[PDB]
Design a binder for this molecule. Structure first.
Ligand SMILES: OC[C@H]1O[C@H](O[C@H]2[C@H](O)[C@@H](O)[C@@H](O)O[C@@H]2CO)[C@H](O)[C@@H](O)[C@@H]1O
Ligand SMILES: [Mg+2]
Length: 391
């Protein structure tokens, strides 16, 4: 009787799983009908779509699938949910995810699933070549990748190097593990450092010196790296947990041969993973009847049983604490439970209302360095300069 719309991506199996979740939702709320609006794979491109939605004052979409990096920017256009804190049972959620949706003391979204970078590796190939463990340092990964890739005739290491938000997530994991940072605890840009130049040079060296990563990586997003790994054509892959639901399914040629581990440590004496995730917000311009229906859909989708269903079938990490005690979860995706320390310790991108502009600066110069249009020193030097103008 009440019609609402919801945006969704189509990466992996998430759209297929959502349709099934909506079918279960309609059994519980036949008075509400939901239409899915599909989105492009790129988070950067999705961001621009939302800007045009809010600029026009559109009453659709009603439920917004938002990247964890957007709440600070999009808070003026989102329904304030602070009074619904107990309605959504936010006390049951991972506290870090609730902090991500809190903007100036106001709750502007409900956490749906959380994310962190992980290392996928061909466990069969590592044992075949005398390695009983996942690489613990970046240098050990290169050594393993070099030896196995030329013996087997496949790529060593695939990741996300296209000029979009995914590149920033990959770059920060190298920057942080090498001992650098973008901003200090105050506002000051500190990215102009020898550690940052070394981190970016290492990414360049993976392609041109060590030759463990194909130059085509400068066009890869999440799914491009996933297919190459899934088809047995890469020893290592950096990606999010979702890829597990596909590379270990019955349709995968490498099912049962995939291991998951934290990303390796760097010269900074520490390993790091970029915090990711997606949250559900409500369009401020929707009618009050639509907002009420949207609240029921968001509560249903973020309930215990639905978070478990999404985790098992789409490989996306729950935001409710208690789901990690469920034996069904450990059965489907053991790394989600065993590597929980990775997800609570995942480092966030800078939380500023203009992050997408900060990300755009990082995208241009990092990608330019990966394609050899500039050097690592000039790239880092130009990032710092233009970031200081933004901040
Ligand atoms: O590409 C950057 C983006 O990656 C992650 O989002 C993925 C997610 O992991 C997948 O499960 C699926 O939802 O596709 C998304 C990309 O559209 C991070 O969650 C996100 O924070 C990050 O910006
Ligand atoms: Mg509407």
């Amino acid at each position: 009787a009440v019609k609402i719309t919801m945006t969704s991506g189509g990466v992996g199996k998430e759209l297929e799983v959502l349709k099934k979740q909506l079918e279960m939702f309609h059994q519980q709320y036949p008075d509400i009908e939901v239409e899915i609006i599909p989105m492009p794979d790129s988070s950067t491109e999705r961001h621009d779509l939302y800007v045009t939605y809010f600029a026009a004052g559109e009453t659709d979409p009603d439920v917004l699938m938002l990247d964890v990096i957007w709440p600070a920017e999009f808070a003026p256009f989102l329904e304030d949910l602070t009074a619904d804190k107990d309605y959504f049972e936010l006390g049951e959620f991972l506290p870090g995810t609730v902090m991500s949706v809190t903007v100036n003391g106001r709750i502007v979204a409900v956490p749906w699933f959380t994310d962190a970078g992980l290392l996928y590796y061909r466990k069969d190939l590592l044992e075949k070549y005398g390695y009983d463990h996942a690489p613990r340092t970046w240098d050990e990964l290169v050594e393993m990748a070099k030896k196995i890739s030329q013996a087997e005739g496949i790529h060593g290491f695939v990741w996300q190097g296209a000029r979009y938000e995914g590149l920033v997530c990959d770059f920060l994991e190298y920057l942080w593990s090498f001992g650098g940072d973008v901003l200090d605890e105050s506002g000051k840009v500190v990215i102009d450092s020898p550690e940052a130049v070394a981190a970016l040079q290492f990414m360049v060296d993976l392609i041109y010196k060590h030759k463990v990563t194909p130059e085509g990586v400068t066009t890869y997003m999440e799914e491009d790296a996933r297919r190459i790994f899934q088809n047995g054509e890469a020893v290592f892959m950096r990606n999010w947990p979702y890829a597990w639901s596909l590379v270990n399914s019955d349709e995968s040629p490498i099912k049962g041969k995939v291991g998951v581990a934290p990303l390796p440590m760097g010269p900074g004496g520490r390993r790091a993973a970029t915090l990711g995730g997606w949250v559900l917000g409500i369009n401020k311009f929707s009618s009050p009847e639509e907002k009420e229906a949207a609240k029921k859909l968001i509560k249903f989708l973020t309930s215990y049983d639905q978070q478990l269903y999404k985790a098992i079938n789409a490989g996306q990490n729950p935001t409710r604490k208690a789901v990690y005690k469920d034996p069904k979860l450990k059965e489907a995706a053991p790394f989600m439970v065993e590597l929980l320390g990775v997800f609570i310790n995942a480092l966030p991108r800078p939380r500023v209302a203009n992050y997408t502009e900060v990300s755009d600066v990082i995208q241009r110069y990092v990608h330019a360095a990966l394609t050899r249009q500039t050097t690592s020193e000039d790239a880092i030097k130009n990032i710092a300069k233009e970031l200081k103008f933004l901040l």
